[PDB]
Design an enzyme around this catalytic site. Structure first.
Site, PDB file in Angstrom:
ATOM      1  N   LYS A  11       2.586  11.365  -4.015  1.00  0.00           N
ATOM      2  CA  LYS A  11       1.458  10.687  -4.681  1.00  0.00           C
ATOM      3  C   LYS A  11       0.467  11.666  -5.319  1.00  0.00           C
ATOM      4  O   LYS A  11      -0.297  11.290  -6.215  1.00  0.00           O
ATOM      5  CB  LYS A  11       0.742   9.805  -3.680  1.00  0.00           C
ATOM      6  CG  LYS A  11      -0.317   8.872  -4.272  1.00  0.00           C
ATOM      7  CD  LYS A  11      -0.722   7.799  -3.277  1.00  0.00           C
ATOM      8  CE  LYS A  11      -1.945   7.014  -3.729  1.00  0.00           C
ATOM      9  NZ  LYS A  11      -2.347   5.990  -2.718  1.00  0.00           N
ATOM     10  N   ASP A  36       0.862  -1.162   0.000  1.00  0.00           N
ATOM     11  CA  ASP A  36       0.000   0.000   0.000  1.00  0.00           C
ATOM     12  C   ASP A  36       0.911   1.227   0.000  1.00  0.00           C
ATOM     13  O   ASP A  36       1.503   1.566   1.031  1.00  0.00           O
ATOM     14  CB  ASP A  36      -0.910  -0.032   1.240  1.00  0.00           C
ATOM     15  CG  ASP A  36      -1.747   1.217   1.416  1.00  0.00           C
ATOM     16  OD1 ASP A  36      -1.772   2.140   0.573  1.00  0.00           O
ATOM     17  OD2 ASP A  36      -2.443   1.269   2.458  1.00  0.00           O
ATOM     18  N   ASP A  77     -12.968   5.230   3.049  1.00  0.00           N
ATOM     19  CA  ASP A  77     -11.523   5.285   3.230  1.00  0.00           C
ATOM     20  C   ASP A  77     -11.056   6.689   3.611  1.00  0.00           C
ATOM     21  O   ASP A  77     -10.916   7.576   2.761  1.00  0.00           O
ATOM     22  CB  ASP A  77     -10.839   4.817   1.927  1.00  0.00           C
ATOM     23  CG  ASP A  77      -9.344   4.694   2.043  1.00  0.00           C
ATOM     24  OD1 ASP A  77      -8.717   5.322   2.925  1.00  0.00           O
ATOM     25  OD2 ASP A  77      -8.777   3.954   1.211  1.00  0.00           O
ATOM     26  N   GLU A  93      -7.116   0.240  -4.524  1.00  0.00           N
ATOM     27  CA  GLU A  93      -7.188   0.272  -3.057  1.00  0.00           C
ATOM     28  C   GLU A  93      -8.486  -0.306  -2.460  1.00  0.00           C
ATOM     29  O   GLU A  93      -8.422  -1.171  -1.586  1.00  0.00           O
ATOM     30  CB  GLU A  93      -6.900   1.702  -2.521  1.00  0.00           C
ATOM     31  CG  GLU A  93      -5.415   2.063  -2.606  1.00  0.00           C
ATOM     32  CD  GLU A  93      -5.106   3.542  -2.521  1.00  0.00           C
ATOM     33  OE1 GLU A  93      -5.930   4.323  -2.031  1.00  0.00           O
ATOM     34  OE2 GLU A  93      -3.997   3.914  -2.956  1.00  0.00           O
TER      35      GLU A  93
HETATM   36 MG   LIG Z   1      -4.965   4.743   2.010  1.00  0.00          MG
END
Ligand SMILES: [Mg+2]
Ligand SMILES: Nc1ncnc2c1ncn2[C@H]1C[C@H](O)[C@@H](COP(=O)(O)OP(=O)(O)OP(=O)(O)O)O1
Length: 382
Positions: free
Chosen positions: A71, A9, A199, A176
């Site tokens: 990111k 991740d 999330d 994800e």
């Molecule tokens: Mg995350």
């Protein structure tokens, strides 16, 4: 021979690695004993590169040389409106090179370097690789890496390219929310179900509606807030205590980078404590101009300072349902992802939104995405 494939991740704020070891998925603690690693890079005076906990925790008068949130930039061109907005708010220099965003920092010894976002991500991946290698007692060459469901082809390829730099063949890029569902075994069920993944990470909030149909996932709709996460809850507490300190002492501590960093560190610790306690003490020796700081924060105050932000997470859920042509009662499973979903008030709000249905957090929400990546990686191992 691809060896033992790991699952990573690669998160905006925090990253996590898992692996199938002895017939079981293991989420791996790093050398600081933590199962999540900050996606942070910094440098010592000697020019030693710090990655992870050491990078985030280094006290510095020059925070502009600390890199994070790569990111947000990875796989994007310069005039992407997302890039143009994020460069206003990122505290390190992002400069245009070859019509793309690059990160410019000083790395020790008066040496300046410019890095592509994928180079920063590669450093984070290298740390995750090393964490896994230490636990496995062997070299790791291949990985499954997760990305947000909204990532486009360029962002997915850029993530693979970060792997290449890090000495990893990223064999699969997987979504994800899907990885989180896989952690719960939802891929190994006959029939069809609707799964709402909620999330709330350190910097971003993603809601996804997945259908699962005999082991095949479809991401039907996504929503959220690209600039809402746990760090924002910390900042509300920061602002509260900076204001309180100025009221009590007359001093504005924002003048001292290191004082703000100290307070931030203690606020992050206090916030985590308040997920399992009703009050927490924040204590800092020599906080500002040689004076000590000591204050308590109650869970009620934490919640009050953030209640608008917590409540804002519901509208994206309603939008995802609308875009999926589903009602609340069509949701078969609610999967919580991100440490911020450990906050009792967030769990309460989600449960209430779904009229009493208990959201799933039986797998640590900070680890669920890596866990699913590792399940997928297990089938690819040789
Ligand atoms: Mg995350
Ligand atoms: N981002 C976060 N926001 C709020 N609370 C959090 C966050 N991350 C973790 N917490 C809370 C949940 C727990 O009460 C506490 C510790 O969580 P975590 O580090 O995931 O360890 P854990 O619950 O598995 O315990 P242990 O390591 O002792 O086995 O912090």
């Amino acid at each position: 021979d691809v060896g033992t494939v790991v699952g990573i991740d690669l998160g905006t704020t925090y990253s996590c690695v898992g692996v199938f070891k002895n017939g079981r998925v293991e989420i791996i603690a790093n050398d600081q004993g933590n199962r999540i690693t900050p996606s942070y890079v910094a440098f010592t005076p000697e020019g030693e590169r710090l990655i992870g906990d050491a990078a985030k925790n280094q006290l510095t008068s020059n925070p502009e040389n600390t890199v994070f949130d790569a990111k947000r930039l990875i796989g994007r061109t310069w005039n992407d409106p997302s890039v143009q907005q994020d460069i206003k708010f990122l505290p390190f220099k992002v400069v245009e090179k070859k019509t793309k965003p690059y990160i410019q920092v000083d790395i020790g010894g008066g040496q300046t370097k410019t890095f592509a976002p994928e180079e920063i991500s590669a450093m984070v991946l290298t740390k995750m690789k090393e964490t896994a290698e230490a636990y496995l007692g062997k070299k790791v060459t291949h990985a499954v890496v997760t990305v947000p469901a909204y990532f486009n082809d360029a962002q997915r390829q850029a993530t693979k390219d970060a792997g290449t730099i890090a000495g990893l063949n990223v064999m699969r890029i997987i979504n994800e929310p899907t990885a989180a569902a896989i952690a719960y075994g939802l891929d190994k069920r006959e029939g069809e179900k609707n799964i709402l993944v909620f999330d709330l990470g350190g910097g971003t909030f993603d809601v996804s509606l997945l259908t699962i149909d005999n082991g095949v996932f479809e991401v039907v709709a996504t929503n959220g807030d690209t600039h809402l996460g746990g760090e924002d809850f910390d900042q509300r507490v920061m602002e509260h205590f900076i204001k309180l300190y100025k009221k009590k002492t007359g001093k504005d501590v924002r003048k001292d980078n290191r004082a703000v960093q100290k307070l931030r560190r203690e606020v992050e610790k206090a916030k985590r404590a308040l997920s399992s306690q009703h009050q927490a003490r924040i204590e800092i020796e020599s906080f500002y101009e040689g004076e000590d700081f000591s204050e308590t924060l109650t869970r009620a105050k934490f919640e009050e300072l953030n209640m608008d932000l917590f409540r804002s997470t519901m509208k994206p859920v309603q939008k995802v349902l609308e875009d999926s042509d589903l009602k609340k009662s069509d949701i078969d499973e609610i999967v919580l992802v991100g440490g911020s979903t450990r906050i009792p008030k967030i769990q309460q709000l989600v449960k209430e939104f779904f009229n009493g249905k208990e959201p799933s957090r039986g797998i640590n929400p900070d680890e669920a995405v890596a866990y699913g990546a590792a399940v997928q990686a297990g089938v690819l191992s040789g």
